[PDB]
Design an enzyme around this catalytic site. Structure first.
Site, PDB file in Angstrom:
ATOM      1  N   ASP A   1      -8.308  -5.444  -5.103  1.00  0.00           N
ATOM      2  CA  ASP A   1      -7.944  -4.210  -4.367  1.00  0.00           C
ATOM      3  C   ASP A   1      -8.776  -3.028  -4.892  1.00  0.00           C
ATOM      4  O   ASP A   1      -8.764  -2.777  -6.123  1.00  0.00           O
ATOM      5  CB  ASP A   1      -6.464  -3.941  -4.595  1.00  0.00           C
ATOM      6  CG  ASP A   1      -5.867  -2.954  -3.614  1.00  0.00           C
ATOM      7  OD1 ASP A   1      -6.547  -1.952  -3.305  1.00  0.00           O
ATOM      8  OD2 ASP A   1      -4.735  -3.212  -3.167  1.00  0.00           O
TER       9      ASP A   1
ATOM     10  N   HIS B   1      -7.089  -5.589  -0.613  1.00  0.00           N
ATOM     11  CA  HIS B   1      -6.007  -4.619  -0.363  1.00  0.00           C
ATOM     12  C   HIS B   1      -4.952  -5.250   0.552  1.00  0.00           C
ATOM     13  O   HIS B   1      -5.178  -5.259   1.742  1.00  0.00           O
ATOM     14  CB  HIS B   1      -6.594  -3.321   0.200  1.00  0.00           C
ATOM     15  CG  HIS B   1      -5.561  -2.251   0.277  1.00  0.00           C
ATOM     16  ND1 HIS B   1      -4.681  -2.027  -0.771  1.00  0.00           N
ATOM     17  CD2 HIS B   1      -5.232  -1.388   1.267  1.00  0.00           C
ATOM     18  CE1 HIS B   1      -3.853  -1.059  -0.444  1.00  0.00           C
ATOM     19  NE2 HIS B   1      -4.180  -0.633   0.804  1.00  0.00           N
TER      20      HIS B   1
ATOM     21  N   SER C   1       0.873  -1.196   0.000  1.00  0.00           N
ATOM     22  CA  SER C   1       0.000   0.000   0.000  1.00  0.00           C
ATOM     23  C   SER C   1       0.910   1.246   0.000  1.00  0.00           C
ATOM     24  O   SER C   1       1.716   1.346  -0.883  1.00  0.00           O
ATOM     25  CB  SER C   1      -0.980  -0.115   1.162  1.00  0.00           C
ATOM     26  OG  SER C   1      -1.754   1.054   1.371  1.00  0.00           O
TER      27      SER C   1
ATOM     28  N   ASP D   1     -14.513 -17.546 -14.518  1.00  0.00           N
ATOM     29  CA  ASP D   1     -13.856 -18.615 -13.705  1.00  0.00           C
ATOM     30  C   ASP D   1     -13.193 -19.697 -14.569  1.00  0.00           C
ATOM     31  O   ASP D   1     -12.030 -20.069 -14.284  1.00  0.00           O
ATOM     32  CB  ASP D   1     -14.861 -19.260 -12.751  1.00  0.00           C
ATOM     33  CG  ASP D   1     -14.240 -20.238 -11.769  1.00  0.00           C
ATOM     34  OD1 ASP D   1     -13.027 -20.517 -11.890  1.00  0.00           O
ATOM     35  OD2 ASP D   1     -14.975 -20.722 -10.892  1.00  0.00           O
TER      36      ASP D   1
ATOM     37  N   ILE E   1     -11.961 -18.963  -8.668  1.00  0.00           N
ATOM     38  CA  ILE E   1     -10.745 -18.114  -8.885  1.00  0.00           C
ATOM     39  C   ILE E   1     -10.589 -17.767 -10.372  1.00  0.00           C
ATOM     40  O   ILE E   1     -10.456 -18.719 -11.197  1.00  0.00           O
ATOM     41  CB  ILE E   1      -9.465 -18.801  -8.369  1.00  0.00           C
ATOM     42  CG1 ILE E   1      -9.467 -18.944  -6.844  1.00  0.00           C
ATOM     43  CG2 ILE E   1      -8.231 -18.048  -8.852  1.00  0.00           C
ATOM     44  CD1 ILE E   1      -8.265 -19.686  -6.314  1.00  0.00           C
TER      45      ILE E   1
HETATM   46 CA   LIG Z   1     -10.778 -20.684 -12.391  1.00  0.00          CA
END
Ligand SMILES: [Ca+2]
Ligand SMILES: O=C(O)c1ccc(C(=O)OCCO)cc1
Length: 560
Positions: free
Chosen positions: A449, A485, A182, A261, A270
């Site tokens: 973020d 973040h 940051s 995805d 993810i």
């Molecule tokens: Ca995936």
């Protein structure tokens, strides 16, 4: 007087013989500390000398006192390495200075027998708290306290620590390491650009290298979200927090997973292929994959669609600020699953606290609407500074002008002799001197973020590769899908950046991958998930067989 001894420590405190690079260095504390046992929350700390004090104690043009505080910890048994931790927010606090390595690690650098130092950045949240200048951001009223927050604190404290190490141990540090996220990531990039010889290895996480444009993004997200807002606050400003409920954001996340995805070859919650995902995903036309229908409400709002006014708002906010000429003033943001996420009943607040704030509230509490970030812009980054009462701040972001107000981060005025982009920005791609003395930089960034755009970090890195072909020999970027973040969110947000930094600097071994693991594997309903972080532009690709939560079943590779 033997070296690395109780007497050597005490001697750093008078008419004694210690020669500081800055003659205005005052040592308050030089104490011997016993080795401390490991706890549930920290690794064992070795026996060490704690030196705290201050550099360049003076009075600001605001009548407030200023100094650059530091805290230095020098183990009795030393590995020959020097370490500095970066700050966060607008700094102003002096940490314990055991050397945080971020990535939610238990171990401090001091726990591995590094000498460790931290600074407050040249102001103190307890003393530089001005109720007529928005509180702990009040340092911005003093021009020197600005230069200290930008570059000079980190400089003075690095030189003083290295001098203290040389005297205490009777030799200089073999190598020096900086790690920050940051504001601490901005500090690491600033160091590679302005003080190339200060640190041999730098880890720069979620780096605010354009931090003075955050307030401009913030104004924009606010104005963009005001139409989908329901109800007002005490000052008559729309409640940006009510634009989207936690369930609404979860739906947005489920729609992003729906189209994005599987573009990495694996449905796992993810989005590894962030690029294909930005090409593929439009909230105005994408399917809600539960009911097969459009994510965007055809008729009245239900739990299972978002309204047109909501789609418009989030799209405008993620596109990023433009002036009336249509020049981009910051950057766009990545659609990613990490905008929400579910662990048990608990909704990820990591993403939403930045632009929206807490749904469950009579008031606006967004960082970029009324919080620390919007205040910092007005008092720290605009020249001249615009102090005002704390209740006018949200209104000020609503009536922000994208043709006048953005000029103020480039401006100088009276005693403010450098612009905020001069002193705080770290936009230089001239890293040749860093590279050519053997400097190594690991950048990382959570795709979800909302403080700073992972894609803005990536564009910096593209511009670095263009200015310095072969850049991957000394600087690599690890983007982290799902991560918020610096930590949090549905991704592998935990990692030891220090070990691979030391290996790169000392052995010349570049990280082809860095093991990460999720701090909240609740998000994928498992006990553990471990995955390789990959050097930009590479991503994690599943091999074809094996447990999907095991790193050995993943390779780093080019996108399809
Ligand atoms: Ca995936
Ligand atoms: O942590 C770190 C961190 C530091 C600063 C900010 C921020 O947005 O304020 C800037 C106003 O232009 C956000 C995160």
């Amino acid at each position: 007087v033997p070296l690395a001894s109780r007497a050597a420590c005490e001697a750093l405190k008078g008419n004694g013989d210690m020669v500081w690079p800055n003659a205005a260095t005052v040592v308050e504390v030089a104490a011997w500390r016993d080795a401390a046992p490991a706890t549930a929350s920290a690794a064992a700390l070795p026996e060490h000398c704690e030196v705290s004090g201050a550099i360049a104690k003076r009075t600001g043009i605001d009548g407030y006192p200023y100094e650059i505080k530091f805290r230095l910890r020098m183990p009795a048994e030393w590995n020959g390495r020097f370490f500095m931790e970066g700050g966060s927010g607008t700094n102003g606090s002096l940490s314990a200075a055991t050397g945080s390595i971020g990535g939610g690690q238990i171990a401090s650098a001091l726990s591995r027998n590094f000498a460790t130092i931290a600074t407050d950045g040249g102001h103190d949240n307890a003393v530089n708290d001005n109720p007529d200048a928005l509180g702990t951001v009040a340092f911005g009223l003093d021009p020197q306290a600005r230069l200290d927050m930008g570059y000079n604190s980190y400089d003075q404290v690095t030189q003083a620590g290295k001098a203290a190490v040389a005297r205490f141990y009777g030799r200089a540090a073999d190598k020096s390491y900086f790690i920050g996220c940051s504001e601490g990531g901005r500090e690491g990039m600033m160091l590679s650009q302005r003080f190339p010889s200060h640190y041999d290895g730098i880890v720069a996480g979620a780096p605010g290298y354009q931090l003075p444009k955050a307030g401009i993004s913030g104004a924009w997200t606010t104005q963009s979200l005001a139409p989908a807002a329901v109800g007002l606050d005490a000052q008559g400003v729309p409640l940006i927090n009510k634009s989207f409920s936690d369930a609404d954001l979860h739906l947005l996340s489920q729609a992003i997973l729906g189209t994005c995805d599987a573009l990495d070859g694996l449905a796992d919650g993810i989005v590894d292929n962030y690029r294909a995902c930005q090409a593929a995903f439009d909230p105005a036309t994408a399917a809600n994959p539960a009911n097969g229908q459009a994510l965007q409400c055809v008729g009245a709002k239900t739990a299972d669609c978002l309204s047109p006014v909501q789609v418009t708002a989030i799209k405008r906010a993620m596109a990023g600020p433009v002036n009336s000429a249509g020049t981009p003033l910051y950057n766009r943001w990545a659609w990613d699953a990490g905008m929400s996420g579910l662990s048990g009943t608990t909704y990820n607040q990591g993403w939403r606290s930045w632009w929206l704030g807490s749904f469950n509230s009579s008031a606006n509490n967004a960082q970029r609407v009324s919080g620390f970030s919007a205040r910092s812009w007005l008092v720290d980054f605009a020249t001249p500074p615009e102090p005002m009462p704390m209740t006018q701040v949200a209104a000020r972001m609503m009536k922000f002008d994208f043709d006048i107000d953005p000029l103020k981060i480039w401006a100088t005025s009276g005693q403010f002799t450098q612009s905020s982009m001069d002193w705080h920005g770290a936009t230089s791609t001239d890293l040749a001197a860093f590279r050519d003395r053997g400097g190594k930089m690991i950048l990382y960034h959570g795709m979800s973020d909302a403080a700073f755009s992972a894609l803005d970090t990536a564009d910096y890195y593209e511009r670095l590769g263009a200015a310095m072909p072969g850049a991957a020999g000394f600087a690599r970027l690890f983007l982290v899908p799902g991560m918020n973040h610096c930590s949090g969110g549905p991704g592998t947000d935990r990692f030891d950046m220090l070990t691979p930094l030391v290996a790169w600097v000392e052995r010349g071994e570049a990280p082809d991958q860095i093991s990460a693991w999720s701090g909240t594997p609740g998000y994928f309903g498992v006990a553990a998930r471990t995955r390789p972080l990959c050097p930009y532009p590479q991503i994690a690709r599943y091999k074809g067989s094996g447990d999907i939560n095991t790193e050995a079943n993943f390779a780093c590779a080019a996108p399809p």
